[PDB]
Amino acid sequence: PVQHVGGTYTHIPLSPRTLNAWVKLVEEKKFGAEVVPGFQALSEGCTPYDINQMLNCVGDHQAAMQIIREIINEEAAEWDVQHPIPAGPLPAGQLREPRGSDIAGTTSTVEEQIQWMFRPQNPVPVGNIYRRWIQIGLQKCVRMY
Amino acid sequence: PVQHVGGTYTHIPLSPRTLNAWVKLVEEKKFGAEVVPGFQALSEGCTPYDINQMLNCVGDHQAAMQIIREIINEEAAEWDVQHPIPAGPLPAGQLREPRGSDIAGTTSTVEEQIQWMFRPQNPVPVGNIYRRWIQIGLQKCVRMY
C-alpha cells in the first residue's frame, strides 16, 4: 500500500497479520473458492510490489504459481498489444508509460508503480489492473486444483 | 489475536483487510460454501473479542446472526452445566474459571480472554472453543440459507 506524507507518496508494506491471513486463507482448503474474494479484499490499495509479496508468501504452491504465471503473461501480452508504445516523443529522465511487465512488477520498481498510480497527469492504476489479472488466475487455480 | 511482547500478553486487532476479507467471503454467495473455510482461516489465533469483531461486521445479516445466536446459546448453556461451580459462587480474587459467556466474550474482556488462554497453570483455549461454536453456527447457516 501507499501513503501520503508531505507532498510525498510512499510505500508501506502489507502488515504481517494480513500476509499471514492470506497464507492461512490459501492453505485452508488449498485454493478453495474463498481465496478469490479473500484476495480482492486483502489486496485492496496495493501496488504490484505488494501483490508479488502476497504471491511470494504462497510460492511453495508451485502448481498455482504456474497457473497464475500463465495468465499474467497472457494478460501482459494482450496489454502490450493494446498499448503500442507511441513513436516518441518521450524526454530523457521522464518515466515510460508502463508495459505489461511493469504492471506485473517484474521490470518496474515500487517507486515507479507509485508514480503511475498517483501521477496527476493520467494516472495508470497498475496495482488495480494487476489485481484483475491475478483474480482470473486465482479463479483458474480454484477450477483446476 | 495476541502479541507476546515484554513478558506481557497483549491484544493485537485483526488488520482491517483481514476483516474486509471476511465480509467479502460472507457476502460472496450469501453464506455459501466458503464461509466455513474462510472463517476457520481468518479467525486463527483470535480471542473471542476478535471473533465478535468479525461478527459485528456481518451484523446486518440478522437471519444468520440469529442462527448463530441460537447456537452460542445452546453451547454456552452446556458449558455451564458441565462446569458445575459449587454453591455458592464464593468467590475470591484470582480470576474466575470461564463460564459459557466468558468464552462468548459477553461477560469478559480481551485481557480476561488472553488471561485464560496463556496463564501457565491450566490455560483454557477460549478463542478456539468459541471458534468451534461459531463454526457449527456457520455450518448451520450454510445449510439454512
Numbering used by the authors:
A (entry chain A), B (entry chain B): 2 to 146
Paper lines:
Certain monkeys have modified their TRIM5 genes by swapping the virus binding B30.2 domain with a cyclophilin A domain inserted into the TRIM5 locus by retrotransposition. This leads to expression of a TRIMCyp protein with antiviral activity against viruses, such as HIV-1, that recruit cyclophilins. Here we characterise the molecular details of Cyclophilin-Capsid interactions focusing on TRIMCyp proteins from Macaca Fascicularis. Using a structure/function approach we can show the molecular details of how adaptive changes in the TRIMCyp sequence switch specificity between members of different primate lentiviral lineages.
In a previous study comparison of the crystal structure of the N terminal capsid domain of HIV-2 with HIV-1 indicated that the HIV-2 CypA binding loop is shorter by a single alanine residue at the position equivalent to HIV-1 CA88. Furthermore, Mafa TRIMCyp2 restricted the HIV-2 mutant with an extra alanine, whereas the wild type virus remained unrestricted. HIV-2 can be made insensitive to these charge changes by introducing A88 into the capsid, resulting in susceptibility to Mafa TRIMCyp2. This suggests that the two viruses normally utilise different binding mechanisms but that insertion of A88 confers an HIV-1 like binding mode. To test this we solved the structure of HIV-2 with an alanine inserted at position 88. The introduction of A88 increases the structural dynamics of the HIV-2 CypA-binding loop and allows it to adopt alternative conformations. Importantly, this allows the main-chain nitrogen of the introduced A88 to adopt an orientation that in HIV-1 permits hydrogen bond interaction with cyclophilin residues G72 and H54. These hydrogen bond interactions are not affected by the E143K mutation, explaining why HIV-2 with an inserted A88 is no longer affected by the charge change. Position CA88 is therefore a critical determinant of sensitivity even to mutations that are over 20 Å away as in the E143K Mafa TRIMCyp2 allele.
